[PDB]
Write a protein that binds this ligand. Structure first.
Ligand code: HEM
Ligand code: HEM
Ligand SMILES: CNCCc1cccc(OCc2ccc3ccc(N)nc3c2)c1
Ligand SMILES: CNCCc1cccc(OCc2ccc3ccc(N)nc3c2)c1
Ligand SMILES: C[C@H](O)[C@H](O)[C@H]1CNc2nc(N)[nH]c(=O)c2N1
Ligand SMILES: C[C@H](O)[C@H](O)[C@H]1CNc2nc(N)[nH]c(=O)c2N1
Ligand SMILES: [Cl-]
Ligand SMILES: [Cl-]
Lengths: 362, 362
């Protein structure tokens, strides 16, 4: 039955992909072989070329992503050959090292074997490969609240965090046929971190804030021509506001604005003073200053929006419809200072693409 | 035919209105009379009570409005009796005076005769009763670009602006049966203006910015039970960001951020400095400081959002569905610091309500 669903998604994708590749003539034949492989096996296998291009198309079609200008330069690592948990661990470790590139971050995706019958071969439990643990007990709040449930899941499995506010969570993933996942502590030599300082307020270091260099989202599914790559972690570099305006700012995350207000020497007593706003701007200047100073890639929300404008222009020139989610494309500080705020975007879902999937903890 | 449309909108509205008024028993009879009046005349007439409540419901159902907590205290002035252009002028003048209230702004709406057959009795050309003129010729840009087309329309009709950046546009409106509108210069004694100063940067006054105290939107149609009040200007007080983050900030409006950056003594050379953001925050602090200091009502975006949260809670307690437009409800600075950013809103249109209508110039 579902060989139907597979076949159509496959037809649609190969047509578009080979088209974009200048390989339109080779379609009729490639579709032939696929049509057979699906009938005989129930599935089909992407060539390295198809997979590379599909991953890139997927990034292109991500409505919520402001960084899409650079879709065609995505570094694609094809790890469909892994069979063991040591191989998976080692692939994840390598992804971190190669994407980090001593600070000159390379947008990279590592692609693991896809689901078979809907049966996962590898299931990654991390939300990002590098993420801080979070604890809550007895009114005591430590670390990143967003991580509380995964952190408790790890500590069931024999891991124990030091309970600093910046414990690195271990890599944790499950292999097909194992009832439980395995976890591996991150080698600290692989993980770049950036201490947050302010370009001119020396007291800012008193907050003793830091963040990791590279966000590597490891819990979304990549879908390409009806093939489901549930384990396919990817990364770009950070936009400063993600760190300065959310991770460090949100009440349900690190909730640092009162503390920022104090070190920058303004009162946090009256709404009409806009002290949250002033705090947000200084925290965000500090984050950009710190990353740049350490030689770790980052982009500010203005430059990002200028880049996205070129992505829009480039879509038009190529004859491709542009899709977008305005509510995620606008930055969370000074959104109306970007062109994004002042236009609308069609939020249709086009495949290939990256999707949410159910967490296996919680 | 359309006596149908009128009758249903009328049924729906009277039911809800009398319900909310504790007057449910009086519905069957009120609907009777309306049912007759529609058959015999093609239309019906709202009692003062119905009109007052409908205007209030309309404000309640305005998805894009963050200030809805205070819907039930709207001051409703019923001017369905006007017949002459001197009466219309004088009603508009009075609205300005009573809503301004020496700075202690009263949310007010003045309601003029409704459309008859779709035939307007009074057509107001102003977008707000108090608005600045705008000019563009020979690379020369003066005043508010948003006003360029109405400003050129007035100058056709024999008005002439002084071409400062803050010329007050005249009131301009057309009466049924006149081919052309009339215009009347605003008496400067009626219009409060606020010079923009900064609480601690004395140089800020060098920008010589100002804005008017009371935004009185005069080009939307109020619709209540199938009756179309195309001329029904209303006002609240300003949220600071409307002035500081848009009117004065937008590139297509007064475009003051570079000038703000200079007077606050920061460079405007690098995106990574977030100088636009820092400028926005200081301009916005200045606007709140200036209004408060002059004793003219204004609300900051945090307090506003706290109020809107209570509106949400109050809707729930009353059994009413909440509708909202997230893309207009979030403020344009520090939106993620408000609860609004972190939830979703249903954007359905519920009547009574305020609607856009076609401009008669341009
Ligand atoms: C190169 C630098 C990149 C930047 C600066 C960037 C920027 C962003 C930002 C700011 C968001 C919003 C995330 C949030 O607010 O939680 C986002 C979402 C997203 N980005 Fe990118 N991105 C980049 C690269 C990538 C890459 C390489 C991919 C995949 C190949 C990707 C796919 C996505 C997806 C799928 C989302 C939405 C996830 C969701 O719905 O939660 N981006 N991006
Ligand atoms: C009492 C103080 C009030 C505040 C602070 C307030 C705040 C706001 C703000 C900030 C907007 C967004 C406007 C924009 O960004 O251009 C807005 C939209 C709106 N408000 Fe309110 N408002 C208030 C009173 C009122 C009143 C009295 C009414 C009508 C009775 C009203 C009806 C609306 C409508 C219809 C819109 C949307 C107009 C459109 O679609 O362009 N508001 N309000
Ligand atoms: C704040 N949103 C959290 C909910 C959620 C759940 C799963 C994935 C997810 O991704 C956000 C996301 C995804 C990809 C990114 C790529 C680069 C980048 N700088 N940020 C990125 C941010 C976000
Ligand atoms: C920036 N939007 C301009 C487009 C447009 C066209 C016609 C009306 C309009 O209203 C915005 C609006 C409406 C009512 C308001 C009431 C109070 C207030 N403080 N702002 C308010 C702002 C807005
Ligand atoms: C709908 C579309 O996103 C459009 O850019 C909206 C965004 N929100 C807005 N908000 C305000 N206050 N004023 C506007 O003109 C717009 N435009
Ligand atoms: C869709 C709904 O508006 C929701 O609050 C969205 C808004 N935009 C967001 N933007 C980011 N970056 N992260 C989020 O979690 C959300 N949540
Ligand atoms: Cl993150
Ligand atoms: Cl305005």
């Amino acid at each position: 039955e579902e060989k139907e669903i597979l076949w159509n998604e496959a037809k649609a994708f190969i047509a578009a992909c080979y088209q974009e590749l200048g390989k339109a003539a080779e379609v009729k034949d490639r579709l032939a072989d696929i049509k057979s492989e699906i009938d005989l096996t129930g599935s089909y296998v992407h060539t390295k070329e198809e997979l590379e291009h599909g991953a890139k198309m997927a990034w292109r079609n991500s409505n919520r992503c402001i960084g899409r200008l650079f879709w065609n330069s995505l570094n694609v690592i094809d790890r469909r050959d892994v069979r063991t948990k040591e191989e998976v661990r080692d692939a994840l470790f390598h992804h971190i090292e190669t994407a980090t590139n001593n600070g000159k971050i390379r947008p990279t995706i590592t692609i693991f074997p896809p689901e078979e019958k809907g049966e996962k071969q590898v299931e990654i439990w991390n939300h990002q490969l590098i993420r801080y643990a979070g604890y809550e007990s007895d009114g005591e709040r430590i670390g990143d609240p967003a991580s509380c449930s995964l952190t408790a899941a790890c500590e069931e499995l024999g891991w124990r965090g030091e309970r600093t506010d910046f414990d690195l969570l271990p890599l944790i993933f499950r292999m097909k046929g194992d009832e439980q996942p395995v976890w591996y502590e991150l080698p600290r030599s692989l993980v770049i971190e950036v201490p947050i300082t302010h370009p001119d307020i020396e007291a800012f270091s008193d907050l003793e804030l830091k963040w990791y260099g590279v966000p590597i989202v490891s819990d979304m599914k990549l879908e390409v021509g009806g093939i489901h790559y549930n384990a396919a972690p990817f990364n770009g570099w950070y936009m400063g506001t993600e760190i300065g305006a959310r991770n460090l700012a949100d009440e349900k995350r690190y909730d640092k604005l009162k503390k920022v207000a104090s070190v920058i020497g303004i009162a946090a007593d009256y709404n009409t003073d806009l002290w949250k706003d002033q705090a947000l701007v200084e925290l965000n200047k500090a984050v950009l200053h710190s990353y740049k100073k350490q030689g770790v890639s980052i982009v500010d929300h203005h430059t990002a929006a200028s880049q996205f404008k070129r992505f829009e222009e480039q879509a038009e020139e190529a004859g491709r419809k542009l899709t977008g989610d305005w509510t995620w494309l606008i930055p969370p500080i000074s959104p109306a200072a970007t062109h994004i705020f002042h236009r609308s975007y069609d939020n249709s879902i086009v495949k290939p693409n990256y999707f949410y999937q159910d967490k296996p903890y919680e």
